[PDB]
Each structure stands twice: as structure tokens, then as C-alpha cells.
Amino acid sequence: HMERYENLFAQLNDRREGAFVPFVTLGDPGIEQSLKIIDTLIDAGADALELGVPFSDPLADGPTIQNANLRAFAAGVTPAQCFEMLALIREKHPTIPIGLLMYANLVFNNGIDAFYARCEQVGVDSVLVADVPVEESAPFRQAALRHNIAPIFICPPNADDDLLRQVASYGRGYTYLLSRLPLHHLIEKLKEYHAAPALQGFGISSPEQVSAAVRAGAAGAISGSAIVKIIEKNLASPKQMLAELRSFVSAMKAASRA
Amino acid sequence: HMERYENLFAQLNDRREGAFVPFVTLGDPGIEQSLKIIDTLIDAGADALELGVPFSDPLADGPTIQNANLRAFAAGVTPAQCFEMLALIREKHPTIPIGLLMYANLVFNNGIDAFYARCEQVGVDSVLVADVPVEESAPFRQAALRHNIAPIFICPPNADDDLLRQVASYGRGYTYLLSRLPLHHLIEKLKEYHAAPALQGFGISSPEQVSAAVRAGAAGAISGSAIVKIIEKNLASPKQMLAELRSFVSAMKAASRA
Amino acid sequence: TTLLNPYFGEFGGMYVPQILMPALNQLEEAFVSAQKDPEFQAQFADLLKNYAGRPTALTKCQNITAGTRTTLYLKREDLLHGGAHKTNQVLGQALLAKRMGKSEIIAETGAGQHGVASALASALLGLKCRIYMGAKDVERQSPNVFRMRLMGAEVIPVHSGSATLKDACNEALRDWSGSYETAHYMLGTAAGPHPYPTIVREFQRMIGEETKAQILDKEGRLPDAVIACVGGGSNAIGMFADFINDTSVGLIGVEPGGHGIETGEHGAPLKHGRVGIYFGMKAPMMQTADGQIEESYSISAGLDFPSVGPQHAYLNSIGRADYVSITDDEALEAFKTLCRHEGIIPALESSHALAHALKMMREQPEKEQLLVVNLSGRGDKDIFTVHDILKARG
Amino acid sequence: TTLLNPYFGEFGGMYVPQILMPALNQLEEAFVSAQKDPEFQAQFADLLKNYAGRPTALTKCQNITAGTRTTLYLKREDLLHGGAHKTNQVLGQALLAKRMGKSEIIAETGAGQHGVASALASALLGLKCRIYMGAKDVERQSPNVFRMRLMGAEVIPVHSGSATLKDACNEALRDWSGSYETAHYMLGTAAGPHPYPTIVREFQRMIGEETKAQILDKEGRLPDAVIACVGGGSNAIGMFADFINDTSVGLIGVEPGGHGIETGEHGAPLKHGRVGIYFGMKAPMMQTADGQIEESYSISAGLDFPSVGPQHAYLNSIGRADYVSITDDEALEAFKTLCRHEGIIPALESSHALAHALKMMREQPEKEQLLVVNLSGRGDKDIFTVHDILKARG
Ligand SMILES: *Cc1c(COP(=O)(O)O)cnc(C)c1O
Ligand SMILES: *Cc1c(COP(=O)(O)O)cnc(C)c1O
Ligand SMILES: [Cl-]
Ligand SMILES: [Cl-]
Ligand SMILES: [Cl-]
Ligand SMILES: [Cs+]
Ligand SMILES: [Cs+]
């Protein structure tokens, strides 16, 4: 256990800061370009990463991420190639927390336990299984804990109190909060139930929303599609893509210092 | 009443001869050519004529006559134009018996009685209504007798004795015999029942069959399609059409002298 | 001499070549005998119940009549095996052919539905089946002719005349006159020479018999009117027959009005034709002033028969049934209405009946009336037709 | 927490995003309540009887089995309104949506038949209906999409992924997760997340219940085997359900074998796939060695679902049901056989079931066996397909 999320949230609370976590699809638009994209995200001030593995049927993703998956498939990106990227990323950046957004079949394919063992070996910190609800999560979260992986769970805006209790009890690392039923209710109830720190990930596309999520009590914000949009718009110029990526992330991260 | 069939069969029996009656479609392939065709048939030795009026749906006619009807329609031949041809024919040939092959609708169209009145006025001698059986013939044959027209009836090869009696009792001019149940039975039974003289019209296409029909006891032969075939074959040369018409009819008519 | 009356008043008869009369007399005597045979009646009902899907449903259309005092039911002959009511009577006629010891079937067809119905009955009952079709109709109905061939039928194009239905009807009669010893002519409507008008009615009359039992079950009373399209008259006389003696029940037949009666381009001879003699019968028909038989125009190919059953002409002349017409555009609008508000794609044929029912409703929306429309077929065969017309505008 | 078991042994479950779980739980509680509601049961049976044509016939095929000791019956779901068995369960689900106070329907469709069935149910019951369809399937099924539009449905092309059925299934789930307050997702097979496998079975089980009553009536005994094609499993589980506790009755499901199992180009995941998690369920599926979901190949488009209902995977694993496969060529031969010898045009889907029954018969022709084949649909939609293949040879 290396405690990367815990150590990050410590360092962030000691400096009155909120976390900014960008999402990108591994291998979008190409493996080498993706690696540069992730290096400029980390250099621009990202506190942690959420990385998606291209899946053929992402039934829980919007159109922006659907096109990212096809750009990565058009580049011939496989799950095995993603775990090769994950090892190279961890070897360059020992401290940053690296979370995965997975679909259940890529986790179940070669055995659930072996998937989480491969995550631990490459240095992955957390796993969100997009199409596994807490009601079905037992084999997944148990395998994750056995291999020092934090299982991440989404807290939806409609979440009643029994879901809140499960999310608080079952999750680790951070709670994936989709919200703004009252927003301040969910964040305080999750704290009341000793949940992992809540990160807001609904429509986080501007510096102003990163600032608003922190004031609401959440520990930070996840940008679900905004980073992938910048990639898709600057496909013709990989150089200007990285500059616009570095500019945006620095905007969002400075928005979290206050 | 001018008694044309009766006078013909008299003249033929007094000279130990059988009748030969060709069929042609009025206006096939054109009105002027049809008139020449009928003049060369009469000149070649035809004893009487059976003339069809082009009808749109000749459900009782084979393909050779179906194409004759379309050649006459392609020439714009109407029932009114046919009765104009019939008057010109009668005015050139006062003695020859002229029979019509009609379909019931052209007879019924403007009133049955008025149709037979128009036949009498133009000099027509007999009317065969192709799609009127003896069971339905009452209004037709009664109108024909009122206007000195002989109603012609087909005697089919299957005809039982009650049909034979009706045909004998209802018909005049001649009996249209389709035959070779025994052929000699039908001809003798028709004579037994005082029927009009029987003309054979099944497959009369050669001089030999005209000779055979007479020996069988029939008073002559009707050539149902052979004349129409010669027309259809020589469409490109109206000159050679008439020569082949004159050659054929003289062959069939000389076959009836014995 | 016949066992049954060949005329309905002045209409009907047996105007065929003499050589065909034995064929018709043999057919009448078998039919009369079959009708009194309880074992024939049980095999016929068995095929109808276990092979064809009878009894068909009677569907109440609540969406279509909302806001009015009309109650509309549809007799669902579209749910019959084959997709149209024609299947009833070819099953009866094919059993009649077997009763006569015949092994072959002759049929003609225009739009292709009677040929498909004859082919499926011949395949089921082990009969060799040849079908005459006008070459212009052969070219226009490539789906239906492939259906016939798949079912083992031999399809013979007819290029004579106008190369449409009436010219197919001629070529079948000629065939039958030489082959009736082994072959049965399976006529496809309630017209032609006796006994075919009577036979086709009696083999289609379960339509009305079921409707009566179903309407008494659901409403406790007979309908104010039953409405059916009239091409040759078989589906309409099938609906009408059991109601003829219920005088309070209106009988409405709907002929195709085509582009409009005044245009001349229609198929409504019963009301806008003239009595004639063709196809073995005396009936109103589509004919020139000369007496040459013309074709019937309709957007719906199955209403192409240029004449009408003689019992309908008789029922009209005594005032027992009333006959109207519905144009192409009226029928199309009824086609779209049934699809959008009841989820039923009707045959463009049956859309004429429904279109008149909608007119009865819409013209007098406060009139209390219980209407039954005979939905004679489904309209999947028509979606390509309706598609072309509707994008021809917008 | 659920009121019913979401698993059939190891198969099934509710593998959806957390945001969709309230939608599924609300649907389960309404369904459980609807099942105990005699008034819901009476409206459902009413629509089935008076709108859809139920009960369907059970046809004995004597020509097809002559010379053998096989007796073959066909359960005639092809005579159902719409031409396929799908109509049963969309009527049930649309009534369920009304029970939940919903006014809108979401559906996906591949070959177009579930979209047409959803559209007709939505039109009948006054529901606004949007249908997601893969763009490649939209281009291939222009008749069926016009049917949907005629019936008032909005058809939305899906260009993501492979642009086929599975990519339509994804886009409907996403829609529902944001709109489930007003809209009901009308899933079209006995798969997906609980409670849909259970709901689709219970709304299709009259198929087997009728077959049992009809086979007891005509033969005095249960069948030796009931046989049904398996695309997603709805028509097969509908036939199987009432026979599961009659242990002496064999249950045979027929997956599409495509060009042949050994070619890789097939659609038989239950026997030749691998357990996976997709579309809200744990079930065998068509997947790469990596875990990416592939498509299912079949000449018959309606068997394109790349997985299978979890109750079928369960029934297989305990040995209660047996599952086989039938190739394109075997299915085509069965299509031609039924047309020529029974006058019935079967859907190429149902031709797989019949083709296996013919194999059971032909391989052991002296075996005494009473077989029921579920004829899940009519095959008019397939004549153009069969025409092309048959002239591609001769
Ligand atoms: C054949 C056809 C008609 C017309 O035939 P009728 O003899 O007038 O009944 C009507 N509806 C459908 C569906 C048809 O196929
Ligand atoms: C849809 C379809 C199938 C496959 O669907 P299931 O869910 O497996 O029943 C089978 N037959 C027909 C006619 C179909 O339309
Ligand atoms: Cl039924
Ligand atoms: Cl009303
Ligand atoms: Cl047998
Ligand atoms: Cs008509
Ligand atoms: Cs499958």
C-alpha cells in the first residue's frame, strides 16, 4: 500500500486547496501522443489522473468519450497496450494518483482478481467500474482491497440515504460525486458517514465550477469530458493541442487554490 | 328472308359437293386489305363466309385469332366500321352466305334486337354468339328469327343427347360441329333430329380433312384459323398474302368436290 | 338445367362457350353435394381454424373515433394466413377440387394476391398449380410472383390484349375448357359464370357470421352498417351475407374512385359503368360506348377487376345494399390514419372501406352509429407505393 | 435489494451505471404489482385477444413429415399482428409504462422488427415513441423504418461504435438514464439487466401455455420436444416457460450457425462464446480474446444479438434445455421446404428452428417423436434476401 490519494488529500488540505483531476482516454488519439498529453496534464498542475481504457460498448459515456474510444481503436489501442502505458506513466511520476475508468467486461475477462493484481503491479491507485453498481460490487471491491486498489463509486444526484451509506462504507480513495436533490445534503451526509473525500464531476468545464465545488464542501473536481474536447478540436495540430491543454489545466488548477 | 344458306346447300347437294367456309377477322390487318382479302377468298371458291368482329376480350379464341384482333385494333377497327364493310361486301356479292362470329357484349351493347335488325339491314345471314350457350340463348335466337337471321350454335364433341336436341331445334343455317365421343354418332343424331346441315370446324387445315369431314356425313368444313395464319405470315407482302390465300382456298374447295 | 338459380334478378348467368358448360355443371353439382356433406364442412372449418387462423379478431378502434359518437370495429381479415381474406375461399375451392378427384389448379391474378393464395392452398393440399398473369402485372408484382414460385406454382405470363387481369381471366378460361377433366379453375372473386358467385360467397360468409357473433358479444346489438371495399365483390359479400336478412343493418360497398369519377380514371362500374356481358356473366362493367371492355384504375391494384359480382348489382337495384366510391387521395389519408392512431397497416384496398367509415363519422360527428369495417388485408405490400406518393409532394 | 431474484444461477444481474438502478427498481416493483393485479391481467389478455389475434393456431404439418414417424406441429406466431411474436411483450411493456404513469417509450432495434412492434404498441396506447437504430441497419432496413415513421415513431440513427444493434442498445440506455422519469425503456428481448429477462418471459409465456393446451387437445399428450430459434431468447423462453416443470419434454434452442461455427462467422454465443458482462448482464457473448464485444453474423438479421438471455445460459448449464446451431444454408433449405410443402413462408429466423426439426426427423426417420416448432414470424420480409442467394447460384 502506497497511500497516494491519502497523501495527496493531506498535502492539499494542509495548503487549503482543492484537487483537480482530468480524464482522458488512454491511446487517444495515439499511444505516443496520449503519453505526451498525459505528461503535459501532469506538468500543467493535475493532482491526479482518471484514465479510461477504450471499450467497444461504453454504455455509460457521452458522445465526446464515444469518439475518443474510436480514435483510440483507430490507432489499434488494446487493453494490454494501455497497461504498458500505465507502467511508463508511473515510472515517470511516482507520486501522482492514477485512477482507471473501466467497464466491467475488461475487468472480468481474464478473472477479476487477476485484473486488480495487474493494477497493483503497474502502480494503479483506484478503479471505477462504470457499469457496476454498489449492489453488484462485492467481488470487485473485495478484489481491489486485496490488491491495495481503491474502489471508486459514483454517488448519483438521486442517491437516497441507504446508497449514501453503502458508498461511504464501500468506497476508498475518493467518492465520485455527480450532483448540482440538494447538493450540500449529499456532501455533508458523505462526511457524516465517513466517506472518502468527495470529488464533483458533473459539468466541470470552467474554472468557476472548480471554485464552486470546493466552496460547496467537496474536496475537488473531476473534468469528465472537457479535456477530451480539447483533444478532438486540435487533432490537426498536435502542437497547439498540448498548448491549449496546458493553458486549460493551469486555469482549472489555479481555480482550486481558492 | 332470302334463304341464302338453304339455297347454297341445295346447289351443293345437287352437285355432290361439300361446303368450304373460311373465317377471317374483319379489318385484319386493315380495312382496305381485309376487303381485298375477302374478295380473293370469294373469288378463290369460298361457299360462305364466317366473319369475326374484333372484340377486346375473346375468351373463346385461340392465340392466332387473338393476334388478329390486335392487328385490327391497331388499325382502329370498330364495330361500326365492320358493319360498313359488311354492307360493301354484300353489295359486291349478293348470293354468298355471310355469317358473323360475335361476342355477347357487342350484341347486347345497344340492345339485342337492334343488333339483329342491323344485321338484317346490311345483309348478314347468320350470327354465332361465341359466349352464349343454348341454355342462355333464348333472347338472342328469338331476336335473330324475328329479323330473318339464322342463329348458329356450336355442337361440342362431348355433347350429350339433350344438347343435341336443343342444337337441332334451336339452330338454323348450319350447325357448327367441333368433333374428331364418336364423330359419326353426332352427325347422324343431328340428321335424326332434323338439325341444320353440320359443318365440321375442329382442325380443318388441309384439303385431306375437308374431304374426310364430307365422307363422315358433314355437309362441309369451316377453316377456323388457317386463313388467319396465312395473313399473319405474309404481313410484309400484301401481294404474296393474296396469292397464298387464293392458292390455299382453291386447294380446300377442290377437296370438297370429292 | 341447373340445381341453383344462376341469376340474381337480371344479373349473373352462364355466358361461356358451350364447351365449358359441362365443367360448370359438374362444379355446381359437387358444390351442392359438398354443402350438404358434414364431413366436407368439418375439414373446411378445420383448415380455417388450424391452418389459416380463424376466427379473426374484431378490433374496437377507440383512438380513431375519439370526440365523436361513432363506435368503429374492424373485422381483422388482415390477420388471416396470407395477409388477406382470399385465403378463405381458395381453401374451400381446393377442397372442392379434391372432392371432384382433380389434381390440378388453374388461377389468374392481377396484383398477385389471388395467385399467392391459390399457390399456398395448392401446396398445402397437394395440387399442381399453374397461374396466368398479365405480363404488365408480372413486371409490376415481382414479389408476389416469387412467392408463387417459392410455393411450387407455375406462373405463365399473358401478353395478349392489355396484358392485365381481364386478359389473364380470358387465358384461364381457355385453359380450363380443354383441361377441366383434370384441372379446377380457381376463380378469385365473387363474379364470373355461375356457380362461382354463389360458391365464393358461401366460402367467404364466415366473415359476416363471425362479425355478427362478435358484435353481439361485445355490444349486445347488430351494427348500424357494415362497410367493405368492392373489387370483384368477394370480401364484401362475405361480410354482407349473414346480415342480408337483418334489414336494420346497412350494407355499404366501396368501389375505387381512382383519380375521381368525373376524370373517367376510376374502377367503380357498379355505380358508374353500364350493364354488359363478359367473363361469363351479365353485370355492370367498365366498357366503351362501343362495348369494348376497358380497365379499372385504382391506386390499389387489388381493386382492378373491371366488373363486379352480380349479387352486388342485384343488392343495389333492390335497395338492400348501398354502394359508394372513395378516391385515391381519400384512401391514402385513411391508410395514414390507421397506421398512426391504431398501429395497423391496412391494405390500400381496405383503406377505401375505412375511408368511407371515417367520412360517415367526420361528416356527422354527433350521429350515434356502430360501424364495422371489413379490414380485408394488411398493407405491407403497399408501403413502397405510399412512400413514393408521399415524397412526390414532401 | 430487489423483490425478485436477478440471477439465474450465475447468469444475469444488474450491471448498469448507478444512476440507472432507481429506474430498474421502479420497473421491478411496478411489474410485481402488475402481476398480482387481476385488472392488469384482463387488459393485457384483452389486447392480446382483440387487437393482436391470440390465441395463435397450432398447425400440423403432414406433407413435410410424410414417410417418417415424426409428427410436426408449428406454433403460428407468424399469424400474430405485426408478423412476429414480439408484439406480445411490447403490448405488456406498454401497459406497464402506462401503469407507471409514463407517456414515452424508448426502444432500440436492429433488423427493424422490434422497432415496428414498439411503434405499433405506442400508437395503439397513446405513447410517444423514439427508436434508436444503427445507421448501417437504418440503411439496410428502409421498409421497417418507414413502417415506424408511418406509425408516428421518431427514428434516431446511431453512428457510434459499429452502428448496429449493440450500439443502438447502448444509446437507448444512456437516453433512459436521464429520462426514466417520463420514459420507459422497452427492451426487445429476454436479456439485459433485471428485471427485463423476467418481464419479457412472463409477457411471452402465453406462447407455451397455449401450445400445451393445444397439444393436449389434439394429441392427448405433451410434446417430445419444443424447438425455437434463439436470438436474444424471448420467443424461445416464451415457448419453454410452461414446459420447464414437465421434465419429459425436451427444450431445444437453435442459435444461428452463420457460415459455420468453425468459420468464426456465426451468432451462437451460448455454445461457442464466453461468459462476459455487457448490456447490464452476466451472460455468454460474442467477444474477442481481449474482451471487446463483436457482432453476431447470421443470414437472418433478427438473430443479430451478440449475447443471449441469462435464463437460457442457466437452463443450459443444469441440462434442462439443450442448445444447437443451424447454418445459413440449412436455414435457407428449411425456408424453401416450408413454402413448397405447407404454403407457409417462415421468417429466416424461425427457419433455424424448423431446420433443426427437419434434421431430427431426417437423421432418424423411424424415431417416433412429437415435435412442436415455434414459428416466430412470417418471412415476407425475407423473400428478397432468399431471391438474391438463389439466383447467385442458379
Ligand atoms: C383482392 C383484394 C380485394 C378485392 O377483392 P374482392 O373480391 O372485391 O374482395 C380487397 N382487399 C384485399 C386485401 C384484396 O387482396
Ligand atoms: C426478433 C426475432 C427473433 C429473435 O428474437 P428472440 O428474442 O430470440 O425471440 C426470432 N424470430 C423472429 C421472427 C424475430 O423477429
Ligand atoms: Cl385467432
Ligand atoms: Cl367514440
Ligand atoms: Cl408422419
Ligand atoms: Cs370493380
Ligand atoms: Cs444470440
Author numbering:
A (entry chain A), B (entry chain A): 0 to 179, 191 to 268
C (entry chain B), D (entry chain B): 2 to 395
Quote the study on this structure.
We also trap reaction intermediates and conformational changes in macroscopic crystals of tryptophan synthase to demonstrate that the spitrobot enables insight into catalytic events. By contrast, the spitrobot is built around the SPINE-standard, and versatile time delays have been demonstrated. While true time-resolved crystallographic experiments at room temperature offer a much more complete access to the dynamic landscape of protein function, cryo-trapping experiments may be sufficient to solve many important biologically relevant questions—e.g., provide insight into thermodynamically trapped, stable reaction intermediates. It is clear that care has to be taken to only use crystals of highly similar dimensions to avoid that mechanistic conclusions are affected by different diffusion times.
